[PDB]
Amino acid sequence: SPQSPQDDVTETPSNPNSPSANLAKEEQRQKKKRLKKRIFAAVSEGCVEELRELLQDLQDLCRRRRGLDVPDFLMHKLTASDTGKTCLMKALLNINPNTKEIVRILLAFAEENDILDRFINAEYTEEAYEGQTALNIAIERRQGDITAVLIAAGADVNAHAKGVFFNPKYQHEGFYFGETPLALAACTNQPEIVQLLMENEQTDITSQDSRGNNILHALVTVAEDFKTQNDFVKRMYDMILLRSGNWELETMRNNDGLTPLQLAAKMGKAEILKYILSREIKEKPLRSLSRKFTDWAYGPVSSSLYDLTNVDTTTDNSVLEIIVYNTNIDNRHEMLTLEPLHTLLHTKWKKFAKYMFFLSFCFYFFYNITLTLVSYYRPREDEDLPHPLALTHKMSWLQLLGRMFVLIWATCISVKEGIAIFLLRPSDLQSILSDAWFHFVFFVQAVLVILSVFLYLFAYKEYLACLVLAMALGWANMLAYTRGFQSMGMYSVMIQKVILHDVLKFLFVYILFLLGFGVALASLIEKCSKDKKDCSSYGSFSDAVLELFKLTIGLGDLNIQQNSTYPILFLFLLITYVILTFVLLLNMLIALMGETVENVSKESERIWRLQRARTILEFEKMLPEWLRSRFRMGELCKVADEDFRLCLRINEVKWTEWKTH
C-alpha cells in the first residue's frame, strides 16, 4: 500500500548545485554549469537555434583539450552528474514537437567523435534504475520513428535494466516488465515495434531475466482475471509464438524452475491458461506448437487430443498439483472446469478415488465403534485398578478383538497424519487453517489414545478422563468425511468457516460484558450466610458466571434477591444485562450468522468440487510403484517422429445452435 521510491525519483525541476561544485573549471562567471544546465533546458523546451549555438561552444570548450581526452571528458561533462543520465534521456523523458528534429541534430554531433555508440548505450550508475538506457525511454514514449533511428544508430536491443525499480513485492513500487527492451513493447501494446525489433538480427528472444524469465513470463504478469474490452495481452502472446516456430521456447524454466504454463497457473491468470492450453492454430509447418488435435468433429460432437505435458502428477509441480494446493486464488473454480483439466480429474475419481474414499471411510467408521464398546460396556468401573489383563484370555475374547484394533489404527493414522506436519502450512490464521484444520484434529485424536493406553499401564486416576475426550473428539473427526456428497460437502464448510468467522469475533466482546457484569453481580451479596442461606443464591465470582451464561441461553430464574443489600440496583443491573445479551447480542450474532450462511449457500459447487480435488491428490500421493494401469493414454505421435506427446480423448458440446442461415 505505500509506494516508497526511496531516492532520487528521477527528472526533477528542483535542481541543486551538488555535482557542478566538484568540477569548478571556471573562466566566465561559471564556464560549464552555465553550459551544462543550458543544454538541459534547451532540450527540456526544444528551442533549436539556441541549442545549435550551445553545441557550438561545447565543441569550442572541448577544442582545447589534452591528449585524446576529448571523448571521455564530454561524457563527464554531459553525463555522470549524480546518476549517469544523458541529454538523450532528457531528450526522451519529455516530449515536444521539436523532438525528432533536435535528436537527429544531437545524433549528428557525437558522430563527429568516436564514442557515439558508447554514448547511445549509456546506463545508470544510479543504483535505483541501474542499467536503464535511452532505448526503453523511446519505447516508453511510443516513438518508433525515433526508435527506427535508434535501431539505425546501433544500440544494444538486449540490455538488462536490473535496478531497484522492479519490486521484491508483487504489484507495487514499480512494475516488472522483465528488464528487457523486447518485452517492453509487447507489454505496452506496440505490435509494430514488436515486429520491427524481432525482425532485427541482434534480437535475442530466449534470453532470461535475473529471475530466469523469458519474454512469455513477462506476459504472465500482465493480464486480468476476466475478459477486458479487447485486451492486447492475448493477441501479443501468440504473435510472438507465431514468429517463434520452436517448441523449446515454452520448455524454458526460470530461477524457480517454472514453465510459462506452470507460472501461469501459479499467478492465477486463469483465462490466459485457457488460451495457453487450447492452441488450435492450423498451419502445416506450424502444428508443432498446436495443442488441440481436432479430427473427428461432426456437428455438436468434437474429437479432442490434448497436449498433456506438465499436467498429470507424473513429475513434480504439475499444473493440477499447483492449482489445488495453492492459497491466495480468488477464482480457483475457474481453471477447474476447463475441459482437459476437468476430464482428467473426473476420470481419476471414477478410476481411482471412489474406491479409496469408501475404504478410508469404512475403517474409520469401525474405529469409533470399536472405541465405543470398549468405552460403554467396559467394567473399568468394576474395581480393576491394577493389572487389567488377567488370565482366562483376559475375561473374554471380544475384549481382545476391541483392544488390539484400536492400538493398530491409532498409530496407523498417527504416522499417516505425521505426514501432515511436512513442508506445507505457510501461514497460521489463513486458508491453511481453513484447509488443513482436519489434520490437526486428526492427529491429536490418536495421540490421546496412546496416552490413555499409557495411562492404562500406569493407572494414574486420569486414564478414563483421557479416553472420554479422546472419544468425543473422534466423532468430531468423523464429520470430516462429509466433503464428498453435494448435500454434505457444502455443509461442513459452514461450521468451519462462519464459526471461526463470527463466533471468534463475538467472544472477544461478550466476555467483556460477562467479565464486567459478573463482578458487579458477585460483589452485592455481603457473604451473608456462608452457604447456609445463600445456597439458593449466588456466591463466588465463578458461581454467577454459569448463571448469567445460563440467562444468556434462555435458562435460569430471576426471583433471587434475598441477599443483595440493596435489591433494586441488583435488579436494575440484572434486567439491563438480560435486555442487553439475549434481546440484542444473541440475536445480533444470528443476524450476522444468516447473512454469511446465505453467501455460502450461493457458493455451493465451488467448494464441492475442490474438496474432491483436494483429497484425490492426497490419495494419489498414497500410491507407490504400482501405477501402470492408473495412467492415461500413453505413447502418441502427431504424424512424423516417434511419440511426441501423449494425449487425452474426445469431448462434446451442444452449441451447433447459432445464426448464420
Place this chain on the structure above:
Amino acid sequence: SPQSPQDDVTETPSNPNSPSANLAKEEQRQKKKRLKKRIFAAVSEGCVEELRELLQDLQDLCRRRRGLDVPDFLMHKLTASDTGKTCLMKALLNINPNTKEIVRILLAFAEENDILDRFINAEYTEEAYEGQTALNIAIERRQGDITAVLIAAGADVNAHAKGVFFNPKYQHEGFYFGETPLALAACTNQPEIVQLLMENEQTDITSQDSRGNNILHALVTVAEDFKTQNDFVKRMYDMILLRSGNWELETMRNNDGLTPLQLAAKMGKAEILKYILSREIKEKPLRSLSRKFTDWAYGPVSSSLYDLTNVDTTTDNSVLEIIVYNTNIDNRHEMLTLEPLHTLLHTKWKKFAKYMFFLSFCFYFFYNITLTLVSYYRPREDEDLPHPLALTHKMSWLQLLGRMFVLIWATCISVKEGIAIFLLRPSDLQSILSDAWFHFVFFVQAVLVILSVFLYLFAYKEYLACLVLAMALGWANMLAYTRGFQSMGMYSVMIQKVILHDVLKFLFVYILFLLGFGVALASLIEKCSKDKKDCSSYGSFSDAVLELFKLTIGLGDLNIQQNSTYPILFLFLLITYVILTFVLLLNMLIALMGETVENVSKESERIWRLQRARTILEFEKMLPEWLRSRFRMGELCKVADEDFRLCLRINEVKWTEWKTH
C-alpha cells in the same frame, strides 16, 4: 419544506388600483393610468405601433412641465409604483418575438433625455428583491444580444441584489447565486456571456458577497454529490480560473473565514473537491495555479507532489479537520479515499497514532483490573466501617499499589474527558449522540469513583454500591476501544446504532402493553390470604410485572390460578398476553433487528476508516510543542522563488491497461 415568498411575488396579471390613486392628475377620463397601464400591456404583448403612439403622448404629457422636473417625473410616472419596477423589467420578465425590436425603440426614447443611464440602472425599493436591476433579467432570460446592447448601454455589471430572495435557510425559498451579475451567467450555463462579461473592463471579479463570497463560492453551492450527465459546473470553474491567472483568488476567505476549498469541504460537494485538489493543467505561464506536479511517471507508476495548503492540522480549520468533525454529510467516506487526503491520513497513523492508541489502550486495561482486585478480594465485608487505613502500612502494601493507581487515573481521565464538554455538540439526539456518546460514558465513570472514595472517607452505607456500578460501567467503556480492528470496529457501531434505533422504538410500545395487562393481571386476586397462601402467586402491581417480563423472555410458569376469583378470564388474558408478546412482538423486534444489521454489515469499511480518522486528530489534538519530527515534507519551491508550497510524495496506479493499439 414550505416556500413562503412572504409578499408581492412579482409580475402579477391581477392588478389593483393602489398606486395610481395617489397620483390623480386627470384630464380625460383618467389621464395617466390610461397612459401607464397601456404602456405595460403593449410591452406585455409586444404590439409596436400601438406602443409608438403611447410613447408619443408620453412625450406630450411630459412636454408641459415646470423647471427641469421632466426627467424625474417620468421616473415617478413609469417606475416606483409599488416596488420600483420599470418597463424594461416588464420588457424582460416575459419574452416575445418583438422584444429586441421594442427595446431598441425604448432605448432610443430616454436617450432623448439625460437620465437613461440612471434609468437603465434602476433597482427595487421593494424590500424583497432589493437591488434587482434590469441586467440580470436579460441574463435570466438568456438574451446576450440584448445584453450586448445592455453592455453597450453602459450599466453597472457589478450590482448587488441583496434582497430577501437569497435565503437564511439552505436550499429553499429562493436560491443563492451570490447577488452578482457575473456569477449568474456562470451558474446558469452561458459561457459566452461569461467570456463577454469578463472581457469588459468594468468587470470586477474579486468583489465579495454580503457573505463575503467571491464568484467561486457561488460555484460551491451548485453541483451534486455525483457525476451528472456532463454538468457545466466543473467546466465553468476552471474557465474562470484560466482567465484568473493569479493565485490570490482562492486565498480569499468569506465572512465566515472560508477558503473556497474550505467551503467546498464544508458543503460536502465531494466530486468538485477532487477536481479542486488535482489541477494538472500544464502551461508554462500557468502552472502557478496547478497543484499536480507529475514529473516521474513511467507507465503504471506516477510521481506526485501536492499543494497541501490548508490540509494538515497546522492551522485552524483544516480540510482534514472539517471533513471528520462534521455532521450532516452523506458520502463522508468519499473525499477520504482521495489520494493526498488518504495518504496523509494513512502515514500519520503509521507515524503517530499506532503508538498512542496502543498506549491509551493499555493503561485503561490495567485500570479495570486494578479496580477489580480492590473490588473482589476486598475485606470491606470484614467489618471495617470506620477508618479503613490503619497502621502496619495499611494491612498490606498491595492495597496501596491498588488504591493509589485508581485515584490518579480517575482524575486523569476526568480532566481529559472534561475537554469533551468544550465547544462541540450542536444537536442532542443526532450523530453527536452517535459519535460523542463514549465521552458521556467515559466521563460519568470516573465521577462515580471519586464519589465512592468520598463515600469511603464518609461511610454512609452506600459506598460499596457506588463502587459496583462504577465498575461494571468501566468494562462497558472498555468496549469503546473496539474501533481500530476491522473485525471489531464494525461491531460496536451496531450496538450503538440499532439499539438506539429499534429498541427505543419498541419500548415506547411494549410498556404500553405491560402497563395495561399488568393491572389487569393484578386486580384479579381479591387479596385472598395476605401472603400466607398467595405466596405462590401474584400480589401487588410490581409483583406481576417481573413475571410477565419473565414470560416475555421465555421463563416462568403458568399453572398459577389459585386466587383469581374467575379462573378463565385470568387465563384468557394471560394466554392472549403470551401469544401477543413472545409469539409476535419479541419476534417482531428481531425481524427489524436483522434487516438493520444487514444494512450495516454491508457498510463496513465506511465506518471503519472514519473512527480511525476520528481519534487520530484527537490524539493529534493531544500534542504540545514537540512536533518537528511529526511533520510532512517541508520547504519546497516550484522552480523560481523560494519555497512556494510544501508538498507530499508519489503514488501508483495499475491501469496502464486500456485500448488504443
